[PDB]
Design a protein around this ligand. Structure first.
Ligand SMILES: [Zn+2]
Ligand SMILES: [Zn+2]
Ligand SMILES: [Zn+2]
Length: 85
DNA sequence: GAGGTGTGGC
DNA sequence: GCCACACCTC
């Protein structure tokens, strides 16, 4: 399958796209750049940039349907939702 | 909550 | 490659 060949790392992935992303941990490549005025943050993964942009926007797409609380990530909500039952 | 990351449908 | 789920660790 898709093995990392950097300095005997050996980590293996199921898709080449996963391997490509993992290789950035060795190269320091960060292709996803925040465009927020004044911010120069960059990230190795698109979804990391999405998390960063929500720091700028305060956007909380995941509203709990049993109380007022909202969250930036679905896993945060899923954990909270357990406390309603 | 936040960061890091393995994953898979499309 | 995009995107978001899901899990671990702090
Ligand atoms: Zn590697
Ligand atoms: Zn930014
Ligand atoms: Zn709630």
């Amino acid at each position: 399958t898709h093995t990392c060949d950097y300095a005997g790392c050996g980590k293996t992935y199921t898709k080449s796209s996963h391997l490509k992303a993992h290789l950035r941990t060795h190269t320091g490549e960060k292709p996803y750049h925040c465009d927020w005025d004044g911010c120069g943050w960059k990230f190795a993964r698109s979804d990391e940039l999405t998390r960063h942009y929500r720091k700028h926007t305060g956007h909380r797409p995941f509203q709990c349907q049993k109380c007022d609380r909202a969250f930036s990530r679905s896993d945060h909500l899923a954990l909270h939702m357990k406390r309603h039952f």
